[PDB]
Design a binder for this molecule. Structure first.
Ligand SMILES: NC(=O)c1ccc[n+]([C@@H]2O[C@H](COP(=O)([O-])OP(=O)(O)OC[C@H]3O[C@@H](n4cnc5c(N)ncnc54)[C@H](OP(=O)(O)O)[C@@H]3O)[C@@H](O)[C@H]2O)c1
Ligand SMILES: NC(=O)c1ccc[n+]([C@@H]2O[C@H](COP(=O)([O-])OP(=O)(O)OC[C@H]3O[C@@H](n4cnc5c(N)ncnc54)[C@H](OP(=O)(O)O)[C@@H]3O)[C@@H](O)[C@H]2O)c1
Ligand SMILES: O=c1c(O)c(-c2cc(O)c(O)c(O)c2)oc2cc(O)cc(O)c12
Ligand SMILES: O=c1c(O)c(-c2cc(O)c(O)c(O)c2)oc2cc(O)cc(O)c12
Ligand SMILES: O=c1c(O)c(-c2cc(O)c(O)c(O)c2)oc2cc(O)cc(O)c12
Ligand SMILES: O=c1c(O)c(-c2cc(O)c(O)c(O)c2)oc2cc(O)cc(O)c12
Lengths: 320, 325
């Protein structure tokens, strides 16, 4: 059958296409610029890309642009998201894009299910942290707007887009699933540095401005995540939002896993404002596992796959 | 340094890119459709493609469409031509865009300020398409447009379109002081990197496939190895003594002589021993590459080499069966 994947040039999108191709789907991968060799080379190099992968130019800002790509699809995987005035440059596009792709799905008449990649930023952005988050939990928009932490506009954009999308999904018998990853970490097929690896390997690179997100962190392996995407597309019992997250630990525990694996790097021992009495916040993937889905990887796997791919590509120095 | 290649998806263009990249050039490949996986995958998989290759969308039918790809280039290889489909409307679908697109690219080169030389791949169909065949052709010879239009033989519109484009190009070259070179290949034969069957291999391999619609082109045939041709393109771009037109052809023989060789190498195919309307006393017609070899260029490949490479590539890609019954 034929499935569309938006944001195929990205870290999650390209890995998902790979997996969908390996499982024997015919894939329509969307990109905003098909002439960009540094993004399409990696797509066109995937197994079965010659016979089962087609490329489609589309942009979330352009109303109707996903129309033709989606027409004749049985499934859509909406992974793409827009990345000075955030309210209009990021927020509105994301919501409109989202609706735009369900409109395009309905216009298509052939889509049986739409799977949206959401964000942990839709779940736990509030001032007080619960010890365990689940799918009934939603982020606090007034806290986002009033405090404006790093990435606030992506918290707000994805929360609003997913809620706007659920409205539409119930209205129009559009059968909609959402998957909520926490920090996605793993090897990758792209030659640019995955954004979430800038955050995950921050203990190594010393990028302080990324610590807050891993102070109390949650993690999922890219391959577990893509599988979860396909599983949920297929498994017709699937309903609702699904958290996809395999590990949680505070930054001390992360950094401590890393030091032991990577003596080679200058991985600090203590972090500002972080007691060992800091509780870890877990994202419960019970709803997903109760369906039957199983996680195949470990925190160690994630960061090994990551650091190995990053050095191989010259994105990380081999030591400090 | 940076050069543009038009029609980079094709048989000649894709090999030219590969050799240009291998020689340390930065290349700007143009294509009509960059989402076409079967046209771009062979390009993006070339070594150094990630760092030294960029793609650009352009069509000879669209005015100024090559401006952006060309600006910043030091050299342009114009290899593209409308030769995709049989057309019920040759004047507008073939002839017009060939001439205008040629001119439009020369203008783009003017406007770009940075282009030291434009190299155009012409065609043996601008040279020997006339009712009477001379024994040897050289760069002074030009096809007979009244003969073409009178007879309307197969491919008449490509003979006409290239002839009028090159003649228009030469006029424009002189009037605007552009360093212009034309290369006139004969039938191009060899291995290749594209996934579909090269149009010229349909013609070249016709004694094996039995596609009699192509025999008239090879009745009195002339040939050049693809890699020799592409080397000649580079050689000519770089060689500062290059001027005017250049024939690039390394072999000639009549179809009987071609079929003999192919029967010898490939007993597994059913290659005819006779051809209606051809006897052993038929004159071979040579295209003379002396102007090119006089500059210093040396051909490396033989006729056997050309055909072995074409046949093995076609087999490997499943474009020819391994044998007949
Ligand atoms: N990685 C994580 O830790 C993580 C965690 C939770 C959720 N997510 C979600 O996962 C998705 C994938 O993120 P990722 O980390 O794979 O990011 P990425 O590697 O940065 O990929 C993002 C994709 O978005 C596309 N895109 C950006 N603007 C677009 C536009 N205006 N129209 C169409 N496409 C556009 C980009 O395509 P081009 O640049 O080719 O145009 C790119 O392919 C995002 O929705 C994100 O919110 C990620
Ligand atoms: N092959 C030979 O035996 C031989 C002999 C003498 C001369 N030539 C000359 O060599 C050149 C290339 O021939 P080839 O054998 O490589 O043929 P080819 O494989 O068909 O390649 C020609 C290219 O022209 C491009 N094209 C078609 N219409 C176009 C248009 N409207 N705008 C821009 N590009 C267009 C196509 O690229 P896209 O489809 O990506 O856009 C195609 O890749 C031609 O100019 C021909 O006259 C060839
Ligand atoms: O670069 C960042 C980023 O992209 C996101 C992000 C968060 C989400 O919830 C999303 O849904 C999303 O698409 C992106 O968060 C961040 C949080 C930080 O503390 C620091 C960062 O550098 C980022
Ligand atoms: O999309 C992203 C995302 O959701 C989160 C995130 C992870 C968590 O573990 C959370 O608890 C949380 O609230 C947000 O971080 C990110 C960091 C990046 O660099 C880039 C991203 O795209 C995300
Ligand atoms: O398919 C053909 C073709 O493409 C050309 C051709 C000839 C030229 O001179 C050109 O300059 C050109 O671009 C194409 O000739 C042909 C001649 C035939 O008898 C039969 C054919 O099938 C072709
Ligand atoms: O471009 C082409 C071309 O020039 C010739 C050609 C070859 C000769 O040897 C001649 O003497 C002649 O007059 C024309 O054939 C071709 C055959 C194809 O199938 C495709 C082509 O593109 C050409």
């Amino acid at each position: 059958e034929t499935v569309c994947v938006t944001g195929a040039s990205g870290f999650i999108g390209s890995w998902l296409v790979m997996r969908l191709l390996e499982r024997g789907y015919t894939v329509r991968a969307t990109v905003r610029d098909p002439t960009n060799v540094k993004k399409v080379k990696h797509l066109l190099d995937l197994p079965k890309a010659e016979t089962h992968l087609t490329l489609w130019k589309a942009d979330l800002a352009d109303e109707g642009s996903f129309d033709e790509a989606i027409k004749g699809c049985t499934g859509v995987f909406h992974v793409a998201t827009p990345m000075k005035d955030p309210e209009n440059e990021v927020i509105k596009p994301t919501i409109e894009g989202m609706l735009g792709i369900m409109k395009s799905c309905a216009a298509a008449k052939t889509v049986r299910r739409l799977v949206f990649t959401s964000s942990a930023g839709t779940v736990n952005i509030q001032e007080h942290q619960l010890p365990v988050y689940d799918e009934s939990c939603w982020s606090d928009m007034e806290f986002c707007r009033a405090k404006k932490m790093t990435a606030w506009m992506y918290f707000v954009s994805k929360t609003l887009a997913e809620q706007a999308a659920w409205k539409y999904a119930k209205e129009n018998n559009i059968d909609f699933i959402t998957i909520i990853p926490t920090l996605v970490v793993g090897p990758f097929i792209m030659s640019s540095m995955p954004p979430s690896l800038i955050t995950a390997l921050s203990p190594i690179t010393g990028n302080e401005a990324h610590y807050s997100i891993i102070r109390q962190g949650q993690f999922v392996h890219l391959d577990d995540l893509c599988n979860a995407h396909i599983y949920l597309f297929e498994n017709p019992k699937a309903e609702g939002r699904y958290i996809c997250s395999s590990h949680d630990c505070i930054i001390l525990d992360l950094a401590k896993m890393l030091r032991e694996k990577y003596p080679e790097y200058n991985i600090p021992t203590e972090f500002k404002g972080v007691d060992e009495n800091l509780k870890s916040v877990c994202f419960s993937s019970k709803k997903l596992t109760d369906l039957g889905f199983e996680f195949k990887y470990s925190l160690e796997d994630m960061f090994t796959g990551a650091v190995d791919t990053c050095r191989a590509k010259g994105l990380l120095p081999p030591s400090h």
